[PDB]
Amino acid sequence: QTSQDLFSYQALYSYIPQNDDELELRDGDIVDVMEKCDDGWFVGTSRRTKQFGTFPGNYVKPLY
């Protein structure tokens, strides 16, 4: 409302971590950004096993 947090996104497809900082992403997974990187990607926590990994925020889309 006034404060307003960040938002959640639903992933287009599944993603496999290449870096130990990245998140294991599954098709249609929801992500919430832990921190925004000004280079274009965010950190995020997976709805699956509640793990937090970073990956492109333009790789995921608004919740369907």
UniProtKB/Swiss-Prot annotation:
Plays a role in tyrosine phosphorylation of CBL by linking CBL to the insulin receptor. Required for insulin-stimulated glucose transport. Involved in formation of actin stress fibers and focal adhesions. It comes from the Eukaryota. Detected in skeletal muscle (at protein level). Widely expressed with highest levels in heart and skeletal muscle. This is Sorbin and SH3 domain-containing protein 1. Disulfide bonds: none annotated. The modification Phosphotyrosine is found at Y13. Interacts (via third SH3 domain) with the Ten-1 ICD form of TENM1; the interaction induces the translocation of SORBS1 to the nucleus. Interacts with INSM1. Interacts with the long isoform of AFDN and with VCL. AFDN and VCL bind to SORBS1 in a competitive manner and do not form a ternary complex. Interacts with ABL1, CBL, CBLB and INPPL1/SHIP2 through the third SH3 domain. Interaction with ABL1 occurs only after insulin stimulation while this has no effect on the interaction with INPPL1. Interacts with the insulin receptor but dissociates from it following insulin stimulation. The chain holds residues 1228 to 1291 of 1292 of the full protein. It is found in: Cell junction, Adherens junction; Cell membrane; Cytoplasm, Cytoskeleton; Cell junction, Focal adhesion. O-glycosylated. Residues 4-64 form the SH3 domain.
